[PDB]
């Protein structure tokens with residue numbers, strides 16, 4: 015009932031910008047969010 | 062140093078969105094950062110122009126963008142909509158209406174117009 | 179609306195300048 | 198990210214001159230950038246205080 | 247960019263050209279003219295990553311250095327992303343920054359006229375926006391010539 019499936023990669027999703035030379039999009043609200051980043055600093059010291 | 066002890070202005074530093082502040086947390090063999098950022102939301106399309114044509118002179122936003130709805134032009138900061146009347150103190154004035162491409166017709170308000178007399 | 183706002187007269191010289 | 202997705206303010210980044218804008222172009226095994234900068238010209242001197 | 251923006255249908259970026267920067271609509275490849283030149287100028291030793299055994303089955307194996315490497319257990323692996331996929335990412339970046347500029351990222355892409363995008367960049371440099379409007383034709387020509 016299950017199998018290995020081969021498929022091509024997506025690149026995120028398709029989008030576009032209207033680019034009217036007479037128009038600007040301006041935010042009316044915002045969200046403050048917090049994300050995280052993980053960075054190694056040190057190795058186990060050995061001898 | 063740049064995310065916790067200062068406010069980084071680098072566009073891709075301290076995570077995604079605009080950096081506001083951060084808090085470090087320790088971990089075995091490393092550091093984990095909590096990055097607080099601002100992401101603009103709920104945008105709308107307003108008509109825009111680089112300048113307002115008043116008496117033949119061109120008025121440019123002192124800050125922000127000059128935009129409009131179906132009846133009025135107003136000025137707003139670019140990152141968060143707050144429409145305000147375009148006044149002579151909200152704009153730089155130079156050149157003329159035949160210099161700026163895309164200039165539109167809108168009376169600019171003079172705050173001292175009543176002259177208190 | 180502003181949290182922490184205090185009462186302090188803000189100066190404006192325009193009328194004395196006009197008359 | 199600093200030259201294309203935003204405007205870098207580092208004095209020696211995104212080429213020479215003041216950074217105005219840039220456009221990436223790909224190449225085999227790497228990236229080539231077109232960096233558009235502003236350089237002031239034709240100076241004259243005036244008395245100052 | 248996880249939002250692959252299409253090359254805008256509107257080329258009215260003020261007086262600016264950018265056609266040698268943007269993907270060529272007539273090319274199977276998603277490369278721009280300049281990108282196509284970059285690909286043509288860098289020389290790769292070989293391409294396609296497939297050689298069949300029969301293809302080197304003779305004296306020829308000694309002339310084809312890459313096949314000689316394969317016969318000694320040394321191989322070359324393909325990249326995960328293809329040239330076309332990279333061109334699609336650069337295309338998205340160009341579409342994003344040409345039509346929304348700063349605001350194509352850090353959230354939803356928010357449109358803005360090209361001249362305004364540069365006006366804000368100039369203010370960032372420390373040049374009044376008035377310079378661009380006054381010299382808009384000049385600036386577009388200087389750019390178009392530089393490209």
Ligand SMILES: *[C@@H]1O[C@H](CO)[C@@H](O[C@@H]2O[C@H](CO)[C@@H](O)[C@H](O)[C@H]2NC(C)=O)[C@H](O)[C@H]1NC(C)=O
Nearest residue numbers: 030031032033034037039040103104105106356
């Ligand atoms: C800006 O205006 C457009 C209409 O001109 C809004 O709707 C989209 O317009 C584009 C054309 O540029 C179409 O391809 C999309 O399919 C339209 N959206 C939908 C759901 O049909 C657009 O939403 C407006 N932008 C903002 C921020 O309100």
Ligand SMILES: *[C@@H]1O[C@H](CO)[C@@H](O[C@@H]2O[C@H](CO)[C@@H](O)[C@H](O)[C@H]2NC(C)=O)[C@H](O)[C@H]1NC(C)=O
Nearest residue numbers: 129130131132133134135136143144145146147
């Ligand atoms: C464009 O925005 C202006 C505000 O800058 C709107 O003007 C207000 O309209 C309300 C009615 O809905 C009145 O009660 C206010 O007194 C008006 N304010 C001012 C300063 O005149 C205007 O209606 C909006 N136009 C459109 C087409 O949406």
Ligand SMILES: *[C@@H]1O[C@H](CO)[C@@H](O[C@@H]2O[C@H](CO)[C@@H](O)[C@H](O)[C@H]2NC(C)=O)[C@H](O)[C@H]1NC(C)=O
Nearest residue numbers: 034035036109110111162163164258260359361
């Ligand atoms: C944006 O593009 C439109 C055309 O798509 C320009 O519209 C012209 O505006 C002038 C105003 O004096 C009219 O005389 C022309 O007839 C309009 N052209 C068309 C085809 O209708 C508009 O001026 C451009 N805006 C900017 C800022 O460049």
Ligand SMILES: *[C@@H]1O[C@H](CO)[C@@H](O[C@@H]2O[C@H](CO)[C@@H](O)[C@H](O)[C@H]2NC(C)=O)[C@H](O)[C@H]1NC(C)=O
Nearest residue numbers: 112113114115117157158159163164165166167
């Ligand atoms: C603002 O309105 C004035 C008219 O009150 C416009 O000036 C005239 O425009 C017509 C064409 O529509 C010309 O035939 C006249 O010769 C112009 N008058 C003068 C004294 O030159 C002006 O162009 C409008 N400005 C903007 C930015 O729309």
Ligand SMILES: *[C@@H]1O[C@H](CO)[C@@H](O[C@@H]2O[C@H](CO)[C@@H](O)[C@H](O)[C@H]2NC(C)=O)[C@H](O)[C@H]1NC(C)=O
Nearest residue numbers: 179180181182183184185186187188189190191
């Ligand atoms: C500045 O002083 C005025 C009084 O002169 C304050 O207004 C009153 O504040 C009390 C609460 O302390 C309310 O119960 C009254 O209803 C308010 N009066 C009116 C007419 O609304 C005002 O809040 C003070 N502002 C600040 C920042 O201290």
Ligand SMILES: *[C@@H]1O[C@H](CO)[C@@H](O[C@@H]2O[C@H](CO)[C@@H](O)[C@H](O)[C@H]2NC(C)=O)[C@H](O)[C@H]1NC(C)=O
Nearest residue numbers: 214235236237238239240241242243244245246
């Ligand atoms: C700045 O003023 C000076 C003096 O009028 C101009 O000429 C230079 O003067 C210095 C001495 O102060 C000499 O050592 C240089 O050799 C002179 N330059 C030349 C080309 O002969 C100088 O050109 C002015 N700067 C600008 C931008 O006009």
Ligand SMILES: *[C@@H]1O[C@H](CO)[C@@H](O[C@@H]2O[C@H](CO)[C@@H](O)[C@H](O)[C@H]2NC(C)=O)[C@H](O)[C@H]1NC(C)=O
Nearest residue numbers: 256257258259261262263264265266279390393
């Ligand atoms: C950008 O400039 C090029 C010229 O460098 C324009 O394309 C040329 O169009 C003529 C026909 O009018 C052809 O004979 C040339 O061979 C074309 N040159 C190239 C390099 O394609 C192009 O249309 C302009 N594009 C924009 C958006 O302004």
Ligand SMILES: *[C@@H]1O[C@H](CO)[C@@H](O[C@@H]2O[C@H](CO)[C@@H](O)[C@H](O)[C@H]2NC(C)=O)[C@H](O)[C@H]1NC(C)=O
Nearest residue numbers: 238239380381383384385386387388389390391
């Ligand atoms: C700065 O100098 C340049 C030339 O070095 C001027 O631009 C050229 O002006 C000539 C006419 O004298 C035109 O034929 C050229 O086509 C113009 N160049 C371009 C790219 O259009 C420029 O106008 C001067 N700028 C200022 C502000 O004085």
